[PDB]
Amino acid sequence: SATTIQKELENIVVKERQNKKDTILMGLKVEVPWNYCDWASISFYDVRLESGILDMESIAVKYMTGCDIPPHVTLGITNKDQEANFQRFKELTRNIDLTSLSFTCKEVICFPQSRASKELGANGRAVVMKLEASDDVKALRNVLFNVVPTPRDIFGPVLSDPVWCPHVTIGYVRADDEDNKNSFIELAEAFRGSKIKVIGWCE
Ligand SMILES: Nc1ncnc2c1ncn2[C@@H]1O[C@@H](CO)[C@@H](OP(=O)(O)S)[C@H]1O
Ligand SMILES: Nc1nc2[nH]cnc2c(=O)[nH]1
């Protein structure tokens, strides 16, 4: 059970996310086997079409744009002042062939609604394809965090240790329409077992 301090620390984590703007994405641009038309029967949640969003610039809702998402696997998100360190890391890894890296689609997961987005007026949940990452990807991410200071992930209770869930987000849907959510998951489940190829760094 969480303590008083832990509960207070969670509020700080959520607010920190809400306050975050202008961060940089350290991720791998990938090619996926699914297309928009595969989800033609699905209704997506796009904050750009919604009202009551209290801060469109917050990274907690800014990227909740239906299925209009560039296919990518996030390694980490950090502050803009780390841009130089990240650029230096890309140069340090210039000899690494990122296109040799591969992920395997395992299971379709609908992440829980982030409290940071909900408090900013969002009503969406992310449907993602959980990926199996090779040791090369895991090592690449660890060394990235060694060269480029990156906020520690805290997706759960503040006391828990983060378990990286490599994933390619497919689309956001309303958190209050189960039929739509389940139909989406079913359709996305058809792509399980597919292999995703890395093209390079997200730019
Ligand atoms: N400059 C940026 N700063 C923070 N996030 C950014 C971003 N550009 C893209 N995103 C995407 O927004 C994330 C949600 O925070 C992730 O999406 P995801 O992997 O699909 S759950 C992330 O990739
Ligand atoms: N990597 C990762 N992202 C998440 N987003 C929401 N929950 C999680 C989680 O457990 N892991």
Side-chain angles (χ1 to χ4, degrees), residues 17 74 109-114 126 128 141 153-156 161-167:
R17 277 297 271 215
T74 298
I109 299 178
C110 184
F111 284 158
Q113 181 180 21
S114 70
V128 317
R141 182 173 179 265
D153 281 313
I154 294 164
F155 296 114
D161 288 316
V163 181
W164 187 39
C165 185
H167 65 275

Side-chain angles (χ1 to χ4, degrees), residues 156-173:
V158 293
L159 183 62
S160 303
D161 288 316
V163 181
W164 187 39
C165 185
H167 65 275
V168 192
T169 298
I170 307 181
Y172 300 84
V173 299

Side-chain angles (χ1 to χ4, degrees), residues 17 22-25 59-60 63 69 72-74 77-78 111 126 128 167-170 172:
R17 277 297 271 215
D22 186 53
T23 43
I24 59 181
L25 165 65
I59 72 175
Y63 304 95
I69 309 173
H72 67 278
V73 175
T74 298
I77 306 295
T78 191
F111 284 158
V128 317
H167 65 275
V168 192
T169 298
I170 307 181
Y172 300 84

Side-chain angles (χ1 to χ4, degrees), residues 6 89 103 107 131:
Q6 287 165 31
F89 181 81
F103 300 84
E107 296 132 346
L131 306 165

